[PDB]
Amino acid sequence: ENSLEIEELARFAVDEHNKKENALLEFVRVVKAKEQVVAGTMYYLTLEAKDGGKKKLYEAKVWVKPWENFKELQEFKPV
Numbered sequence: 001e002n003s004l005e006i007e008e009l010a011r012f013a014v015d016e017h018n019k020k021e022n023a024l025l026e027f028v029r030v031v032k033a034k035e036q037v038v039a040g041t042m043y044y045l046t047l048e049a050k051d052g053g054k055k056k057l058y059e060a061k062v063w064v065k066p067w068e069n070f071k072e073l074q075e076f077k078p079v
Contacts, residue, residue, distance in 0.1 A: 006033040009071070010047045013060035016073035026050040031057065040065040046079065 007030055014027040032046035043062040048055050061074040 001033050001035050003030075006030050006043070006045065009033075009043055009062050009064070010045050010060070012071055013045060013047065013058075013062055013073055013076060014049050017058075017060070017076040020073070020076075025058075026053075028055060038063075040067075040070070042074075 010030040010033075011027050014025050017023060018025055026049060028048035028050060030045060030047050032044075034044040036042045036044070041064045043060075043064065045060040045062060047058050047060065049058055050056070057079045058076060059079050060076045063072040063074050064070065
């Protein structure tokens, strides 16, 4: 798991969650990441984000098709 790729995907998760749900979570870092080869790659991320300036953990599921510029936030939730 290339940590640079995962950092970008974690930021994309927080940004997409903010777009989708009209929120303002502030990305802090990735804690955990699992890649699972599928039709493309599926990522299960555990990350820190600040809610109201309060650090919290979230789980995100991110689907990537590396042959297109396709990245999709499948789910995002507190742990």
